[PDB]
């Protein structure tokens, strides 16, 4: 995946939490928000690098998906588990995707209905960090199929339920073939995050822009400024989905497209850059937990050190406390790519 | 232009209005609504077939434009068409490029040059023997996040502005939605349903068919399988920004639209495109005319009976008017019995 960089950081952070006896902190949830069809599920699964989320035309995501990535230590290499099926273990990622669709139909029906009941999915991997990603239905305007008159408000409040959590990062997704000032994602992000401390803007579908136009002004922050960044991506077309085009090919073609059409900005756009940018934000959040961790170490070390003049297990736990203080310093000094 | 069919009917109406001394039947105003950039100004000017509206990327329409088409008689004729703005008093505009520029100029004066929006309309009349008497209203597009000079409540200011025009019961709403967006996200159809819940005066226009993602098309949308729209769902293809930059003509735009529909939507091609949008509007306008003939007829009788009384049951004026009103009555029946090709 393009988000493996934090693995060694979280591994040593775990070591500290194990030593100090505390429960490890939770990274913020990464939540995708935007108008229906803006490319949300495509963006979110690109952080995983495995195809597991239903994507397509019209209304697709019809329940929240709480996708918990769970790091697997030494204790198929990758596998999935849904809460609703209890213990069934999925090694086939196409089957995982199909089960999301199955579960969605079971609760939301087979005629465009939307339910707030979340689907809980765990993906176990040695190549993922402990991180929760949240896929959501897109905002809409006119009820279709089974949807009630107030479907727009039902969806919007569903989204707010997730992004009003102060420990969430918002991926505000807007299609490039729409005017940025019409971004429903950015409007709603600014309601819960008025100062842009936890909103990252993603501009999808660069490849679908009208001839004679481009997203240069948008991507240079000259339309709507967004503090944490505005990152352009090119995910698979419906034709590509139908033809089962791989992630590898999608990424290669995305890179080529940016080099061809956005050469001056290409190194600050694309899916790999999105992943790196999210890593930096997650690291920022990690560094804010460290003072809390620090004070804990200092109290327990003074507690073990008063126990002096049994004698080995307190002596080497004092050694393990010392190691934890240095690990904290290392985390603070760690550079990511 | 594609909306000349009603000319003979409105000439007949004018003969009656001239006799009756008032323009008793007013056609509904045609008002374009939709999200910013949905292609509204492009659709509206296509009903004129002359390139007078500013069109482009980003925010373009920033004041209402009340565009009054005024049919001109042969006696008032004379290279055959011109424009006048209320704000430039009696200045006559002969060049339609200059008319487009003046809309931009007058927008900049009141709305500024950093994306601001004003509700104050620009009033423009276009005089021509090739147009009917018809008011078209261009409006700013709906938005979400303030930019430039725009205030924090820009979205509501624009939505409320649109509502003021489309809440007029004597208006046909062109609800414009870009084809490269999901129909269920149509701000145009949402707002239209607030003033026209029953769909009696809302026509859905689906623009930018040419921009749809590979592996997708608007067949379901155009067949009414997504959101049904009683009066119709009509797909169009107007000029791209590259086309605007390359000065592509209206003639070529329409030919390419026709070709596109033939290639991509062959089964539906004859019920889509710009000419079909015009023909659909013509039918709606003719239905309003037919609805109002009893009023017009009654009004003739009010005058006829009156001049007959002044005719002892001045005299010469009464006699001429009675004959003119007799003619007017005959014209009414002809209009009623006219069916469009
Ligand atoms: N050409 C192109 N198509 C894209 C891109 N990203 C997504 N798509 C296409 O857009 C459609 C929507 O993709 P998806 O990721 O399912 O969007 P979504 O916003 O999750 C849909 P919902 O709002 O219902 O959940 C699909 O047909 C997909 O192939 C892109 O960058 N370029
Ligand atoms: N490819 C393509 N481009 C179109 C079509 N219709 C309009 N455009 C393009 O979309 C952009 C917006 O067109 P315009 O007619 O100004 O839309 P508008 O909705 O009036 C813009 P505003 O909301 O600010 O008034 C222009 O760049 C124009 O070339 C279409 O059918 N196909
Ligand atoms: Ca006659
Ligand atoms: Mg989705
Ligand atoms: Mg416009």
From Swiss-Prot, chain B:
Changing residue 41 to I: Decreased localization to the perinuclear region. Changing residue 184 to E: In OPA5; changed localization to mitochondrion; impaired mitochondrial membrane fission. Residues 207-210 are annotated as: G4 motif. Changing residue 40 to E: Overexpression delays protein secretion. Rescues fragmented or truncated mitochondria in PRKN- or PINK1-depleted cells. SMART domains: DYNc, GED. It comes from Homo sapiens. The GED domain folds back to interact, in cis, with the GTP-binding domain and middle domain, and interacts, in trans, with the GED domains of other DNM1L molecules, and is thus critical for activating GTPase activity and for DNM1L dimerization. It is linked to May be associated with Alzheimer disease through amyloid-beta-induced increased S-nitrosylation of DNM1L, which triggers, directly or indirectly, excessive mitochondrial fission, synaptic loss and neuronal damage. Residues 60-62 are annotated as: G2 motif. This is Dynamin-1-like protein. Functions in mitochondrial and peroxisomal division. Mediates membrane fission through oligomerization into membrane-associated tubular structures that wrap around the scission site to constrict and sever the mitochondrial membrane through a GTP hydrolysis-dependent mechanism. The specific recruitment at scission sites is mediated by membrane receptors like MFF, MIEF1 and MIEF2 for mitochondrial membranes. It holds the Pfam family Dynamin_N. Ubiquitously expressed with highest levels found in skeletal muscles, heart, kidney and brain. Isoform 1 is brain-specific. Isoform 2 and isoform 3 are predominantly expressed in testis and skeletal muscles respectively. Isoform 4 is weakly expressed in brain, heart and kidney. Isoform 5 is dominantly expressed in liver, heart and kidney. Isoform 6 is expressed in neurons. The modification N-acetylmethionine is found at residue 3. Belongs to the TRAFAC class dynamin-like GTPase superfamily. Dynamin/Fzo/YdjA family. The lineage of its organism: Eukaryota, Metazoa, Chordata, Craniata, Vertebrata.
């Amino acid at each position: 995946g393009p988000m493996e960089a934090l693995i060694p950081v979280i591994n040593k952070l775990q070591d500290v939490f194990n030593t100090v006896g505390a429960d490890i902190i939770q990274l913020p949830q990464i939540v995708v928000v935007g108008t229906q069809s803006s490319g949300k599920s495509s963006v979110l699964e690109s952080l995983v690098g495995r195809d597991l989320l239903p994507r397509g035309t019209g209304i697709v995501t019809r329940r929240p998906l709480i996708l918990q990535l769970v790091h697997v230590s030494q204790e198929a290499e990758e596998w999935g588990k849904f809460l609703h099926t209890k213990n069934k273990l999925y090694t086939d990622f196409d089957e995982i995707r199909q089960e999301i669709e199955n579960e969605t139909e079971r609760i939301s029906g087979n005629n465009k209905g939307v339910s707030p009941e979340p689907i809980h999915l765990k993906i176990f991997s040695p190549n993922v960090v402990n991180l929760t990603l949240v896929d959501l239905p897109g905002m809409t305007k006119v009820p279709v199929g089974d949807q009630p008159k107030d479907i727009e408000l039902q969806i919007r409040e569903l989204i707010l339920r997730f992004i009003s959590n102060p420990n969430s990062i918002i991926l505000a997704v807007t299609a490039a073939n729409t005017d940025m000032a019409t971004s429903e994602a950015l409007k709603i992000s600014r309601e819960v995050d008025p100062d842009g401390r936890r909103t990252l803007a993603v501009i999808t579908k660069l490849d679908l822009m009208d001839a004679g136009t481009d997203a240069m002004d948008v991507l240079m922050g000259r339309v709507i400024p967004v503090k944490l960044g505005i990152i352009g991506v090119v995910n698979r077309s419906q034709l590509d989905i139908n033809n089962k085009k791989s992630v590898t090919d999608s990424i290669r073609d995305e890179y080529a497209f940016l080099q061809k059409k956005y050469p001056s900005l290409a190194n600050r756009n694309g899916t790999k850059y999105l992943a790196r940018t999210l890593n930096r934000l997650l690291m920022h959040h990690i560094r804010d937990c460290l003072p809390e961790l620090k004070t804990r170490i200092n109290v327990l070390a003074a507690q073990y050190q008063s126990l002096l003049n049994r004698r080995k297990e307190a002596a080497d736990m004092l050694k393990a406390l010392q190691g934890a203080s240095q690990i904290i310093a290392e985390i603070r000094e760690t550079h990511l790519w």
